[PDB]
Every structure is written in structure tokens, then in C-alpha cells.
Amino acid sequence: DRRSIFDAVAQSNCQELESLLPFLQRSKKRLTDSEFKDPETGKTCLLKAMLNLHNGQNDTIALLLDVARKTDSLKQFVNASYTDSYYKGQTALHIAIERRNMTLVTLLVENGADVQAAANGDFFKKTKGRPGFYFGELPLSLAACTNQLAIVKFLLQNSWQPADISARDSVGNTVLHA
Amino acid sequence: LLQVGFTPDGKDDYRWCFRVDEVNWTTWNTNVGIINEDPGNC
Amino acid sequence: LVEVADNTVDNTKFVTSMYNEILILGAKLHPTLKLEEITNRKGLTPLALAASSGKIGVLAYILQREIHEPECRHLSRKFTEWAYGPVHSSLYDLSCIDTCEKNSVLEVIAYSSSETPNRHDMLLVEPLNRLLQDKWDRFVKRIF
DSSP: OHHHHHHHHHTTOOTTHHHHHHHHHHHTOOTTSGGGSOSSSOOOHHHHHHHSOBTTBOTHHHHHHHHHHHTTOHHHHHTOBOOSSSSTTOBHHHHHHHTTOHHHHHHHHHTTOOSOOOOOSTTTSOOSSSOOOOOOSSHHHHHHHTTOHHHHHHHHTOSSOOOOSSOOOTTOOOTTTO | OEEEEEOTTSSEEEEOOEEEEEEOSSOOOOOSOOSOSSOSOO | OTTTOOSOHHHHHHHHHHHHHHHHHHHHHOTTOOGGGOOOTTOOOHHHHHHHHTOHHHHHHHHTOOOOOSSSOTTOSEEEEEESSSEEEEEEOOTTTSSOSSSOHHHHHHTOOSOSTTTTTGGGSHHHHHHHHHHIIIIIHHHO
């Protein structure tokens, strides 16, 4: 069940996944199925694992990546994002960058994580009335505004996919504008 | 009225709280105690 | 401990430190007991006593007390609801401050006799100032 895997990843316990992987393989189901993410929010188990880190390390993420690749799901799995109107478009790469985790972002990007995803949710837009944090809307802008020089260098010079430096967000701001 | 945590007896801790917002650029502390996984408010 | 405070820097520092240490020890030894609720013959609590006597440092420490020790964290009065980047959202307790009690801190400070040393400055502590501004903005300005 989705609740069981969510609890396992949140608790940083990967013992239950030993049956989940063969369970998914035999069940003929895919993690991308609606039955494995929140209805209104859309969060996936990978996002919950990324949120629930301890000392910056969470070995369960490696298990989820291994099982996802075993079933040929990384394409639509890593690039999953919130569908809520408030965190709309917010991907896992944003969590990896915001938590200042170089290894997690390296794994995500080398596994096919898109670097031009726009976190254009209401929480990320420039609104004076409500709380939020505007940093542009792109991972490079987030890394630059959050003070990770190494991460921006890596994104620009990434071998698998380099980050465009002239890209513009919804309001048109570039990294310099942000 | 918001939930803040759990009493040592194990029951819920509910308090009439007043919320404030702050910004800090020097700290950059990514390892602290938090109540909510999702940052924003509604 | 509240009675001994006299608002000087070293005295305030140590009084706050000893207050915190004794609170933690009491929490560990007797988790069920709520030390800060006990009252003296006048009926005041340590918080109310500090507010009335004009002990600004102790009041500031108490209102913003933040304990990160996992075993004893319910003692805290300030909490971090969430943080994303450089942005934090904090919560203040308002347990005995919002004028819904017998004699809240706010009422005690406001209705002082002007004999108390520095009642003018005791409303500058963050929660009290922001709370008064919120109350003014919400409903009382129109009545005024």
C-alpha cells in the first residue's frame, strides 16, 4: 500500500521495500500510478524520502532508485512534481538544492533529472500579501540565490545535461534578474 | 490554536500560538527542528 | 530566582541560566509536574511576578524560551514551524498573555502603578509588541 511505503521511507527503514520491489514487479504496477501519490498534493515516495533526511543521508533513496530503474520507470519517476496550485511545478531537484546536498543533486541529475523545471507555484511567486520565497523559478536561479557556488558550477558544467544560463522564468527574470 | 508537538505523557500539545516570519542570510542552517514538512501555509 | 534578578547584565545572564537548568532538571525528575504554574500567596507565577516586578531580562528570556533537547522540548515557548531558504516561521505560546486569564502579563504590564522600574520598556519584547499591533489593526482601531 502507498501508506506502508510512505511510512517506510519516512522512517528511513528500507526493510519493507525488500518485498515492495518484487511486489511491484509481480503486481504489474508502476510507481507512477495515481495510487502511489497524494491525490490533492501529488507527492511521491521519492519526494517524501528527500524531505525526510537525517544528517544529510538517507540510504532508502538508493533502494528506491534501484527498484525504479529495475522496472524502467526513472524517466517519469524522477521528473515527477507537485500538482498542487500552491507548490505547482516544484520538483525533487529543488529539494536537493535547497537542502544543500551535493550528492543528492548529483545522483538526481545523472539519473535523468531535468534542470529546466519551473517551480511556478504560488509559494514561489513574488507576493507581498502571503508568505513565500522568490528565487526566480529555475534550479540554477535557486542555487544562485541560496548561495551554493559549487552547485551552480556543477549545473552549468554538468556532463549529462548542462543548465542553460540565458533561460527566463514566468516573469522573464534571468539568474541575474533574480 | 495549533499543534506544537507531544507531551511527555504522549498526548498532543495544543497551544494558542502567534505566528511571525523572519529572514536570515548569514545563518544558512539546514539542520534544525521543524514542525511541518511542507514550508508554506495553505 | 525571579526575586533576585535586578536587570544587570551578569545577574540577568546567570538568573536565566539557572532558571533554565532548574527547569530542565525538574522536567527530567518529575515529568508530570508543571513547575511554572505554581503560585505564591499573592497568586502570582514566576512569569507574572517577573512582569509585575519590572524584571525585563527574565521576562524576555521566559517569553522567548527555546529548548532543543529532544527529551524535554515541550518546555519551550518559541518554536520553528517551518523553514525553506533564509525564511523562517516561528510561533509564540501566548499561554498566559492574551488577556484571557485571571491576570495576564499584558494586563499586568499595562496597569502598573508607575512605581515599577521600567514598565515603558517591557512592551518592546517581540511577542507583546507584535500582539498589540495585531490587536490594534484587527478590530480596535475602528472602535477608536
